Design a protein around this ligand. Structure first.
Ligand SMILES: O=c1ccn([C@H]2C[C@H](O)[C@@H](CO)O2)c(=O)[nH]1
Ligand SMILES: O=c1ccn([C@H]2C[C@H](O)[C@@H](CO)O2)c(=O)[nH]1
Ligand SMILES: O=c1ccn([C@H]2C[C@H](O)[C@@H](CO)O2)c(=O)[nH]1
Ligand SMILES: [Mg+2]
Ligand SMILES: [Mg+2]
Ligand SMILES: [Mg+2]
Lengths: 142, 142, 142
C-alpha cells in the first residue's frame, strides 16, 4: 500500500520507517514552548492521503514524557480517512505537566494505519437479554 | 453488521454515524459538573451487544479537552464483548483539568468496534533467545 | 497462536486469560510507592515473543485510577514486535495524581496483540487534490 504524504514545507524533516519501529515517528513542525498546566497544538507538518478504507492512529512515544514533559489530551488520536485535504495538517494535542520546550524535527509521537471499522446497523432494542458483566474493577486487583 | 443498542431512557439523544467520522460520537446521558482535579464517571446512556467476536474502544474527541477541560483516565477504554447486559451502561471516566460543565447530549468521546485478539497460548520459556531491542527512547529524539 | 512469556523471576504472579476479559491483565513486578505528581516506570515483570507479524498494545484498566490514582503517560503503549529480547521487560509508565502505593502482583493495566500495519510506500506529493475536512471539533458538540 501507499500513503501520499504532503509536507508543510521544504524545511520539514521527512518521516521515516525504521526497522524496530512498528509505528512511524512524527515530528514537531516548529519550535514549541509550553508552560506547566498549559495546552498547545504541536503541528506535525504533514498532510496525508491514506489507502482506501484506512484511518490512522496517533499516540505518544514512550519517551515523550521523559524528554518533553507532555501528555496527549485525546490519549489516542484518530485521523479520519476523510482528513486528506491539502490543508488538513496533522497535529499532536499537548498538555505540559512541567515547563518544556520542543524543537523542530523532534520525534514526539508515532502513528500507524488501520482499516476503519465496518459498516454497522444500530438496532435499537428495549432489552438486551444478557446477564450483566459489570465493570470498573468488578474483577478486583488481587 | 449489527450492534444492538439499548438507551438508558427516552430522553437520550440517539447516536449516529456521520460521513467524515470513522468513529461514532457518544454523548453524556445527564448534566455533569466537575471541579478542577476531581474525578467523575460521565455516564454515556447506552448499553450495547456488539457483533460476535468484537470488542469496542472509546477515546476522547480531539476537541474534548478544549470544549470540556477533561482527560480520559483510562486513556482508551476497552468495552469487553461480555459487557452486554441490561445494566451494563457505558461510561467515560473523566479527570478535570479545570472547572467544567458537561450537558446531557454533549458529544464527549467516540467509539469503534474491532475484532478481539485471537485465543493465544501462553508458553513459559526460560530464555527468549533474541537480541535485546531496548526501549523508552532507545532510538533518540532527532 | 502462541506467545512466549519469560517472567522476571519465580515470585511473579503468572498472568492469565479470564472469561470476561478481552485483554489480559498485567501486574506490578514489585511494590511501588509514588507521590502525587511524581513519575515512575512500573515494571510488569514480563518479557515476550509475540507471534510473527504482531505488536501488542497496553492501556490501563478502567479501575486503575480509582484503585491506584495513576494515569499512563504515553496513553496506549505500543510494544514493538522486535522488543523480544531476554532483557526486554515490559513497563507501565505511571504519573500519580494522588499519593499511592501499588503492591506486587497488583493488576494495573491490560494488553492485547494485533497485526502490525502492513508495509507502506510513502509517496511524496506536492498537492493532495482532496477537499479539506478540517478537524479539532469542526463537527461541533451538540
Ligand atoms: O490527534 C489528532 C486528532 C485529530 N486530528 C485531526 C484529524 C481528525 O480527522 C480530525 C478530527 O479528530 O482532526 C489530528 O491531527 N490529530
Ligand atoms: O472507558 C471505559 C472502560 C470500561 N467500561 C466498561 C466496559 C468494560 O468491559 C468494563 C470493564 O473495564 O467497564 C466503560 O464503560 N468505559
Ligand atoms: O508502555 C510501554 C511502552 C513501550 N514499552 C517498550 C516496548 C517498546 O517496543 C519499547 C520502545 O517503546 O518500549 C513498554 O514496555 N511499555
Ligand atoms: Mg519508538
Ligand atoms: Mg470527530
Ligand atoms: Mg478488566
Amino acid at each position: 500500500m501507499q500513503i501520499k504524504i504532503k509536507y508543510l514545507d521544504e524545511t520539514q524533516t521527512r518521516i521515516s520507517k525504521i526497522e524496530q519501529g512498528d509505528w512511524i515517528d512524527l515530528r514537531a513542525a516548529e519550535d514549541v514552548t509550553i508552560k506547566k498546566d498549559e495546552f498547545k497544538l504541536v503541528p506535525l507538518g504533514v498532510a496525508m492521503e491514506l489507502p482506501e478504507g484506512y484511518e490512522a492512529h496517533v499516540v505518544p512515544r514512550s519517551s515523550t514524557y521523559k524528554n518533553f514533559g507532555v501528555i496527549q489530551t485525546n490519549s489516542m488520536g484518530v485521523i479520519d480517512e476523510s482528513y486528506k485535504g491539502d490543508n488538513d495538517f496533522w497535529f499532536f494535542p499537548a498538555y505540559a505537566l512541567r515547563d518544556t520546550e520542543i524543537k523542530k524535527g523532534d520525534r514526539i509521537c508515532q502513528f500507524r494505519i488501520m482499516k476503519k471499522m465496518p459498516a454497522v446497523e444500530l438496532v435499537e432494542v428495549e432489552h438486551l437479554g444478557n446477564e450483566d458483566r459489570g465493570g470498573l474493577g468488578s474483577t478486583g486487583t488481587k
